[PDB]
């Protein structure tokens, strides 16, 4: 997850929950299902 520095060309599509970006719509979609499956990460204990 990086924006601003990576890729001088801002994509037309960008997530809202994480703020991701995908020059294409197809990819962005497949990513819209990555959050649903809460993964063990972050400040969570573990």
Residues that bind Zn ion (CB under 5 A): 15, 17-18, 20
- Give min distance, CB of 28 to Zn ion, in A: 8
- Give min distance, CB of 43 to Zn ion, in A: 18
Please check whether residue 36 is in contact with residue 18, taking contact to mean a CB–CB distance below 8 angstroms.
Answer: no
Report which residue's Cβ sits closest to Zn ion: 15
Rounded to whole angstroms, the Cα distance separating 3 from 24 reads 16
Nearer to Zn ion, 11 or 45 (CB): 11
Please measure the distance between the N-terminal and C-terminal CA atoms of the chain and give it in whole angstroms. 21
């Amino acid at each position: 997850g990086s924006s601003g520095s990576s890729g001088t060309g801002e994509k037309p599509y960008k997530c809202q929950v994480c703020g991701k970006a995908f020059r294409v719509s197809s990819h962005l979609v497949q990513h819209h299902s990555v959050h649903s499956g809460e993964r063990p990460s972050g400040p969570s204990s573990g």
